[PDB]
């Protein structure tokens, strides 16, 4: 989606972040500038968005650039962001973990069981013009115990990932039975 | 199982002043302790040492005892009437009479008088118990 962005002169990090503006830097394999992009829209957007969908960055130069965030460092105590790294793009092929939907009902949901979508945002190598969305997987076959994984999925033409393919992407495990207690 | 967790939930622990010798402290410290068991009426005391905390636990180390003995003395009387009473083994109190002489079995409880004694001594008991599960469970 879109979003306003401004140029940072490099002045009072911890202050420009208190005044309301969120610090950051945009770089790629060529240039790299320092900027400040307010929490207001950033937040609102970033959550709906994430690091999957691209964003615009109109500076006082107008120069709107296509990017995906590479690094967002929190604030530890009390969740909040202190910084963000912007990877500008083009037609240049790069990576990015692509969202994951799992239409289906494992056989692991009739006599006790729940889906643990392990790697629910898989990383794939590919260019801009090649940026999908809800890259669903099938779950209609996940038995209670044994469960899917690796890159054994529907990778639409152009999806040249970077898994194993073994990297367990997801699994289905049992519930929390009241029946417990022990010792000895 | 073998368990008895007397939670300090029904105990009354006191701490009177030491008795006997001592010194400037036998008069001053609440050494002597007394743990009381209320649902029973048992009381254990202790002045063996010169500390209340080494005496209330050492005085408990006994109540656990006596109890397991008087809490078990029951298991002896509570299980000695569940079994029944018949067992004198004297002449004149048989449930079933077995005879190899003339060869036959005389179930005295029923009134039945089988003729196969030697045959019964092989486990064949369906039938005397067939009648036994009647005379017995027939009065209740």
């Amino acid at each position: 989606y879109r979003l306003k962005a401004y140029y940072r002169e490099g002045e009072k990090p911890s202050a420009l972040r208190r005044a309301g503006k969120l610090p950051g830097v945009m770089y790629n394999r060529h240039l790299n500038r320092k900027v400040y992009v307010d929490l207001v829209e950033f937040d609102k957007v970033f959550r709906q968005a994430s690091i999957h969908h691209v964003i615009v960055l109109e500076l006082p130069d107008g120069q709107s650039l296509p990017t995906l965030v590479r690094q967002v460092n929190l604030d530890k105590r009390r969740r909040r962001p202190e910084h963000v790294d912007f990877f500008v793009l083009s037609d240049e092929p790069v990576e990015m973990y692509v969202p994951l939907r799992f239409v289906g009902t494992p056989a692991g949901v009739r006599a006790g069981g729940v889906l643990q979508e392990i790697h629910r945002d898989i990383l794939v190598k590919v260019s801009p013009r090649n940026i999908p969305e809800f890259i669903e997987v099938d779950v209609s076959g996940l038995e209670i115990g044994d469960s899917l994984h690796a890159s054994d999925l529907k990778l639409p033409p152009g999806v040249e990932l970077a898994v194993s393919p073994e990297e367990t992407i997801a699994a289905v495990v049992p519930p929390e039975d009241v029946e417990k207690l022990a010792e000895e | 199982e073998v368990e008895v967790v007397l939670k300090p939930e029904e105990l009354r622990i006191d701490v009177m002043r030491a008795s006997g010798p001592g010194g400037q402290g036998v008069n001053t410290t609440d050494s002597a302790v007394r743990v009381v068991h209320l649902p029973t009426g048992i009381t254990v005391t202790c002045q063996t040492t010169r500390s209340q905390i080494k005496n209330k636990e050492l005085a408990l180390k006994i109540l656990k005892a006596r109890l397991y003995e008087l809490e078990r003395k029951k298991r002896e009387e509570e299980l000695k009437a569940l079994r029944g009473e018949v067992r004198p083994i004297e002449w004149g109190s048989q449930i079933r009479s077995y005879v190899l002489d003339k060869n036959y079995v005389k179930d005295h409880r029923t009134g039945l008088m089988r003729h196969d004694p030697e045959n019964v001594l092989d486990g064949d008991l369906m039938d005397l118990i067939w009648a036994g599960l009647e005379w017995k469970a027939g009065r209740r």
Binding site: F46, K76, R78, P81, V114, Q116, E176, K180 | -
Partner: protein, 141 residues
């Protein structure tokens, strides 16, 4: 209980608690998490009690993630004993928790159940907590 199978050393120095969790600050597993707001030593008997409290709450249901582990030993001298004569004996183990740490996580459970769940588990913890969702807690890369 919930201690470690083996250890190179049985008793270890107390230490300290400088704020900031260092690590463990984002969700990364379940859907809702319980994050510590005050620093503290959480005894395994608490971690335990809290856990049981959750499964008990939504009996026969989702999955629970215990994000902390009591590997630090707790020493305690006997009663009525004076100072010195060596370090006490280990009475249990505790996990050190700092502000920002996500202690627990839950999954495959309704948002109602999740909240209620963690709210009960925090009533078993020696500190103050906060319940969270998921969003920037995606350090996948």
């Amino acid at each position: 209980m919930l201690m470690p199978r083996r250890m190179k050393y049985r008793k270890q120095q107390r230490g300290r608690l400088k704020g900031a969790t260092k690590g463990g600050d984002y969700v990364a597993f379940g859907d809702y998490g319980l994050v510590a707001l005050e620093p503290a030593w959480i005894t395994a008997q608490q971690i335990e009690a809290a856990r049981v409290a959750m499964v008990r709450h939504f009996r026969r249901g989702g999955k629970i993630f215990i994000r902390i582990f009591p590997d630090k030993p707790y020493t305690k001298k006997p009663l009525e004993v004076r100072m010195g004569k060596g370090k006490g004996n280990v009475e249990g183990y505790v996990a050190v928790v700092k502000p920002g740490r996500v202690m627990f996580e839950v999954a495959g459970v309704t948002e109602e159940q999740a909240m209620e769940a963690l709210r009960i588990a925090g009533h078993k913890l020696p500190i103050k907590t906060k319940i969270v969702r998921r969003d920037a807690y995606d350090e996948a890369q």
